[PDB]
Paper text:
To visualize the conformational landscape of dynein activation by [name], we incubated full-length human dynein with ATP and [name] at room temperature for 5 minutes. We identified three major species: individual dynein motors (Open), Phi, and a third state similar to Phi but with two [name] β-propellers bound to dynein, which we termed Pre-Chi. To fully understand dynein’s activation pathway, we began by analyzing particles corresponding to Open. We observed significant conformational and compositional heterogeneity in the Open species and used several approaches to sort out the coexisting subclasses. We obtained six different Open subclasses, which we categorized based on the linker conformation (bent, intermediate, or straight) and the presence or absence of [name]. In monomeric dynein, [name] has been observed bound to both sitering and sitestalk, and to sitering in the absence of binding to sitestalk, but not to sitestalk only.
Cytoplasmic dynein-1 is a conserved, minus-end-directed microtubule motor critical for cell division and long-range intracellular transport in eukaryotic cells. Dynein, a member of the AAA + (ATPase associated with various cellular activities) family, forms a 1.4 MDa dimer composed of two copies each of heavy (HC), intermediate (IC), light intermediate (LIC), and three (TCTEX, LC8, and ROBL) light chains (LC), with the IC, LIC, and LC known as accessory chains. Cellular and structural studies have shown that dynein primarily exists in a pseudo-twofold symmetric, autoinhibited Phi state incompatible with movement along microtubules. [name] plays essential roles in the activation of dynein, including relieving autoinhibition and helping assemble the fully active DDA transport complexes.
Author numbering:
A (entry chain C): 89 to 297, 307 to 410
B (entry chain A): 2412 to 3156
C (entry chain A): 3530 to 3689
Write the structure that this text describes.
């Protein structure tokens, strides 16, 4: 059907197993049809969804891998682990490009902007560091948080990045002004997942209430969206039964995708302030998910070492 | 005013000279026994103040009726009955119901004064209205209903006979700025009655003070420094409140509590007596007499027969009338909580027919638990209507977002709340089983034809971790969730492995239940090494509460504790972060530590803690925090009030100490806030059941199974509910339990 | 005797014809102990077995002073910095021992301070492959080969 109305329906199209540790993040390649997942067994696994078969083994990390990020082309892969190292991978060579050091604790998150000129990372050393792709040097370090930063996610053009910490506050930053635009102290618990609205969702959010528009997901079982211009909570969405670890906007801009600690994944209608479908995701807890802009496929990471591939319709 | 005073004096003159009525009534009241020792001057001054208020009432009626002033006949009929009313409430205000009834019937027998005709209604149940007739208080008290928003709020006071009578008494006392003592058992309603009386006077501001055993007049000096100021006058030095036109009333909750010296004196009591009789106190800074312009007092105390309390001096009791508030009793508590249950059982309309049996069951269980667990068995075995208020508040909070609940679920939440309020403080397994069996039989008696198996079960646990709603949970799934959460928890704060059992599940559920509510302070009693601190840390981490430890060491003076308290209060009020102030008894060194803990746990603020430039720093930080929150504050009084409200909303204090046969009594004497504003959870030593489960879980991963094991005929068993025939691992873990028991022996 | 009687009553067989000293201590380590100034008594040898196979850091109530010399002789290859609780240069020695991973022996435990509570309780934070412990106001990495002994010379002392 049309790309606007891709919705996941039970059951799952594929049932994958074989990991020796819980899965952290599963995300989509932007060009070619290859699946890839990150787990805490100090390795990165590679799969497929159009056939559901094993492809190749990547074993470069020494400790638990936290987050992975993609560039626009998909020829670059950045991964972070608990050994205070940053490792880079390529698609045209499938080898190790560089190994970097400098973080004082576990690197919770990494992010690559669509420009691809440099890779920004967030660690547990109360600092946010961005590193170039040509030299691998920390030219400028973003600082100002008081606990460990959980997730960092920039916008589509990379002109304004955002991060979440344990201070019940999400902070937005600019890669030019090098200072925080606004402090958002409204949650009551740890914030874990951050998402950004696409270009198609800006008009939908505006007519539901310009841009850019920011959404923050926390452990307090509530989801709220925010605006950079006004610095105020636009609307409050309540109904997630357990802890929320991953959120994502729809490519069509009308719905949202999120996962909860209650072993379920839910889709919500912010126009109607209510969900429309709830599915029992896995037998154990879930961590993250992703959505493909064009392909009708949705995946969801979990803790029971099972990754389920769902086809939207 | 002088003319109406003269008329009242001339009409009450025949009742005062020689015997009349007051002398015989006083000599009968002396024969009657009271809670406190009755000096004649105390009740005479009380009667004089109440007659002065009668004159004020006549003057205000004359002001309200400018066309027709007070007629002499109606005035004489009003005074002739107000005198009887005031004599009754003066010579019988500090005694029991039967003794004030005896005084009333003696007065009725002796006087030639018109009285209402009532075969059994006491004269104390009447009011002399301004029209000159007897108006009963029963017609004054209404059958009101309260909204569902305020079901068990601290400010809602549903009226009863005793409530309105004490309201009138306290209004009469405070209308002329006379000190008074609200004596009675804990939880009787004395501070509720005082606050409900003060909210009828918009010209007075209330200050809360909680006395401890180690109370010195420096606490009152610090309160006067914080809430008042010293003003130079041509007639001397005058202390006045900063709030112009407002009368400051000081509420001292533990008047009987400060320790009597070896020479039979109390410094704080003598200080209060000095400033009441002489109207001022000596300032030790320059030895100058300081006079009080607008400062009145009100006292609260348990009866002197209570173990921790001391009798007051007659020289202090001379100026201060005392009124005895008693427990509401069954026949009043039934409607007191019937209105609350009829108000709260509107969210689920299918249960509105069960509010009356629910109230009857709650009152019956509370009364039959009150009679057994007296204060003689344990020092903390005090049961009060505060427990029933917490009961109905807990049932309301569990029934608030549920929107649908059957009768089995309602009786099951009733049983769970009863267990949490009448088992946590209990010590012995015998009395715990007594409470469980009595809960079961009360539910059976007051809830016939109900599903007993569905209503009552073994675990009866309730969590809000598996679901947003306050649903009952199953032990196995709860243990699996706690296992997963502990696996996550080991990598974040403490890398110490733990073994889980049913006692640990119950303890973490109780600690989470108390952390969730505002102003929730724990008091965990148990042997050291039982895991109380680790369980509290795990629950605080899972609830998003920062854990604070004061890190006591050598030469830990009071200044270090004070700066730790300053940091905790600053980060809990200004920065607005939830903090779990966990500290052990070994952290307590001096009496100042426990005094500051008493003040903070009682009121949520410590007067005199921030003095000097640190007070300005606190004010600037509070202004910045208010700006960040989004509500504007000016001056300093409302800034301090907002900071205090944030401290109550955020700060949680967890107190852990070993059980003792004298240490607990001494702690109760030296800090009543630990036994009043904190729920007492008796963890105790690990039971044989807990030891058996720990041994069976830990000895499961090594080869211990012998297929050829012979069951002994004698079978020495120390852990009950042992499976028969036991296996080899069963026998050896039972042997380990026996080894621990014989070390205890 | 009580534990053996219970295990006999519960039909769990145990080696009666053995000594609790001999079953736990080997001959070579017993000879090493006797060379390291340990008294030849079976009670002292059992105390040495306890000091060797401990899990919680032990407290030695030894008025005669021989157990202190036995400890210093047993841990002679590994450096031990003897210090007392009431000494002002005790916390610095504690941090030095924590950093350098050598055994420490402290006397006069009647003047005990609760600064050693995180160390005795093993309240340890795991930073991946790095082991971290925080006491007082400083963060110090904990070496695996760190043992602490508490000494006492007064038998009639009451411990909380
Ligand atoms: N008539 C009543 N109506 C409503 N609540 C009451 C009544 N009597 C007592 N209570 C409850 O009892 C509590 C009063 O106890 P309190 O006055 O604090 O005792 P104390 O001052 O001795 O500690 C209040 O929380 C209140 O909810
Ligand atoms: N259920 C349990 N399982 C495993 N270890 C426990 C358990 N309960 C307590 N412990 C051990 O006992 C110690 C208790 O420490 P703490 O809680 O600080 O003292 P207290 O028990 O006096 O509060 C912990 O270090 C922990 O290792």
């Amino acid at each position: 059907r049309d790309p606007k109305e891709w919705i996941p329906r039970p059951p799952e199209k594929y049932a994958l197993s074989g990991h020796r540790s819980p899965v952290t993040r599963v995300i989509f390649h932007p060009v070619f049809s290859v699946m890839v997942s990150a787990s805490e067994d100090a390795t990165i696994k590679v799969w497929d969804y159009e056939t559901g078969d094993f492809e190749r083994t990547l074993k470069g990390h020494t400790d638990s891998v936290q987050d992975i990020s993609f560039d626009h082309s998909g020829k670059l892969l950045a991964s972070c682990s608990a050994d205070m190292t940053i490792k880079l991978w390529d698609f045209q060579g499938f080898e190790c490009i560089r190994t970097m050091h400098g973080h004082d604790h576990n690197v919770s998150s990494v992010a690559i902007m669509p420009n691809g000129d440099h890779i920004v990372s967030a660690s547990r050393d109360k600092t946010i560091k961005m590193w170039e792709v040509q030299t691998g040097y920390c030219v400028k370090t973003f600082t100002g948080h008081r606990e460990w930063v959980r997730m960092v996610r920039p916008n589509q053009d990379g002109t304004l990045i955002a991060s979440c910490s344990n201070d019940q506050t999400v902070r937005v930053w600019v890669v030019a002004t090098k200072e925080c635009k606004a402090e958002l102290r409204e949650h009551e618990h740890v914030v874990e997942c951050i998402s950004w609205a696409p270009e198609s969702s800006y008009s939908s959010i505006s007519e539901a209430t310009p841009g850019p528009f920011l959404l923050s997901g926390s452990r307090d079982k509530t989801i709220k969206m925010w605006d950079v211009s006004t610095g105020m909570c636009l609307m409050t969405l309540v109904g997630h039964d357990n802890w929320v670890r991953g959120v994502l906007f729809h490519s069509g801009g009308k719905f949202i995708l999120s996962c909860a600690d209650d072993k379920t994944l839910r889709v919500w209608d912010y126009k109607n302030k209510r969900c429309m479908k709830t599915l029992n995701a896995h037998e154990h807890f879930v961590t993250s998910l992703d959505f493909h802009k064009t392909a009708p496929y949705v995946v969801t990471g979990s803790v029971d070492q099972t990754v389920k591939v769902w086809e939207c319709r | 005013m002088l003319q109406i005073q003269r008329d009242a004096a001339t009409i009450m003159q025949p009742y005062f000279t020689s015997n009349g009525l007051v002398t015989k009534a006083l000599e009968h009241a002396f024969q009657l026994e009271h809670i406190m020792d009755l000096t004649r001057l105390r009740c005479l001054g009380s009667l004089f103040s109440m007659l002065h208020q009668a004159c004020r009432n006549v003057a205000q009626y004359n002001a309200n009726h400018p066309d027709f002033p007070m007629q002499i006949e109606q005035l004489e009929r009003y005074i002739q009955r107000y005198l009887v009313y005031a004599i009754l409430w003066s010579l019988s205000g500090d005694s029991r119901l039967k003794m004030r009834a005896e005084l009333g019937e003696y007065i009725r027998r002796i006087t030639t004064v018109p009285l209402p005709t009532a075969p059994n209604i006491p004269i104390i149940d009447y009011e002399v209205s301004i029209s000159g007739e007897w108006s009963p208080w029963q017609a004054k008290v209404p059958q009101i209903e309260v909204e569902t928003h305020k079901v068990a709020a601290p400010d809602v006071v549903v009226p009863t006979l005793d409530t309105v009578r004490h309201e009138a008494l306290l209004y009469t006392w405070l209308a002329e700025h006379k000190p008074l003592v609200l004596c009675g058992p804990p939880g009787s309603g004395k501070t509720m009655t005082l606050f409900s009386a003060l909210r009828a006077l918009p010209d007075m501001e209330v200050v809360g003070l909680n006395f401890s055993s180690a109370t010195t007049p420096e606490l009152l000096l610090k309160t006067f420094d914080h809430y008042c100021e010293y003003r130079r006058t041509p007639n001397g030095v005058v202390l006045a409140p900063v709030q112009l036109g407002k009368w400051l009333v000081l509420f001292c909750d533990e008047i009987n509590l400060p320790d009597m010296d070896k020479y039979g004196t109390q410094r704080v009591i003598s200080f209060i007596r000095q400033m009441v009789e002489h109207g001022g106190f000596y300032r030790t800074s320059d030895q100058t007499w300081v006079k009080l312009e607008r400062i009145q007092f009100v006292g609260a105390c348990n009866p002197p027969t209570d173990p921790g309390r001391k009798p007051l001096s007659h020289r202090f009791l001379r100026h201060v009338p005392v009124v005895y508030v008693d427990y509401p009793g069954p026949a009043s508590l039934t409607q007191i909580y019937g209105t609350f249950n009829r108000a709260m059982l509107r969210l689920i309309p299918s249960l509105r027919t069960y509010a009356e049996p629910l109230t009857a069951a709650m009152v019956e269980f509370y009364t039959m638990s009150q009679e057994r667990f007296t204060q003689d068995t344990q020092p903390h075995y005090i049961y009060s209507p505060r427990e029933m208020t917490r009961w109905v508040r807990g049932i309301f909070e569990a029934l608030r977002p549920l929107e649908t609940l059957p009768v089995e679920g309602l009786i099951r939440i009733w049983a769970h709340e009863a267990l949490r309020l009448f088992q946590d403080r209990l010590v012995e397994d015998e009395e715990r089983r007594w409470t469980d069996e009595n809960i079961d039989t009360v539910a059976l008696k007051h809830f016939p034809n109900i599903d007993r198996e569905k209503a009552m079960s073994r675990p009866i646990l309730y969590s809000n971790w598996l679901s947003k709603d306050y649903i009952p949970v199953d032990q196995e799934e709860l243990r699996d969730y706690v296992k997963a959460r502990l696996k996550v928890f080991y990598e974040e704060e403490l890398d110490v492995p733990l073994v889980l059992f049913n006692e640990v599940l119950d303890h973490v559920l109780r600690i989470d239940r108390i952390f969730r509510q505002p102003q929730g302070h724990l008091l965990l009693i148990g042997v050291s090494g039982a895991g109380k601190t680790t369980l509290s840390r795990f629950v605080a981490w899972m609830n998003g509460l920062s854990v604070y430890q004061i890190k006591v060491h050598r030469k830990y003076t009071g200044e270090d504790f004070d700066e730790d308290l300053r940091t905790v209060l600053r980060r809990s009020g200004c920065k607005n972060e939830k903090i779990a102030f966990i500290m052990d008894e070994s952290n307590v060194l001096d009496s100042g530590f426990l005094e500051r803990m008493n003040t903070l746990l009682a009121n949520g603020e410590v007067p005199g803690l921030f003095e000097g430039d640190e007070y300005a720093t606190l004010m600037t930080q509070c202004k910045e925090g208010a700006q960040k929150e989004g509500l504007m504050l000016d001056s300093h009084e409302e800034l301090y009030k907002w900071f205090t409200s944030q401290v109550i909303r955020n700060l949680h204090v967890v107190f852990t100490m070993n059980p003792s046969s004298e240490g607990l009594k001494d702690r109760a004497a030296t800090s009543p806030a630990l036994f009043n504003r904190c729920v007492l959870n008796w963890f105790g030593d690990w039971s044989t059941e807990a030891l058996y489960q720990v041994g069976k879980e830990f000895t499961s991963k090594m080869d211990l199974e012998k297929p050829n094991y012979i069951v002994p005929d004698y079978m020495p068993v120390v852990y009950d509910k042992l499976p028969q025939p036991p296996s080899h691992r069963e026998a050896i873990v039972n042997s380990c339990v026996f080894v621990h028991q014989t070390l205890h022996q | 005797t009580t534990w053996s009687h219970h295990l006999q009553q519960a039909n769990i067989q145990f080696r009666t014809d053995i000594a609790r000293t001999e079953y736990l201590s080997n001959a070579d380590e017993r000879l090493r102990w006797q060379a390291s100034s340990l008294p030849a008594d079976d009670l002292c040898t059992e105390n040495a077995i306890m000091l060797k196979r401990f899990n919680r850091y032990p407290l030695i109530i030894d008025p005669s002073g021989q157990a202190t010399e036995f400890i210093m002789n047993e841990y002679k290859d590994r450096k031990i910095t003897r210090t007392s609780f009431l000494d002002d240069a005790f916390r610095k020695n504690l941090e030095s021992a924590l950093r350098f991973g050598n055994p420490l022996l402290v006397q006069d435990v009647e003047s005990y301070d609760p600064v050693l509570n995180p160390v005795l309780n093993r309240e340890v934070r795991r930073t991946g492959g790095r082991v971290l412990i925080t006491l007082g106001d400083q963060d110090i990495d904990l070496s695996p080969s760190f043992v602490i002994f508490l000494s006492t010379r007064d038998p009639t002392v009451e411990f909380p």
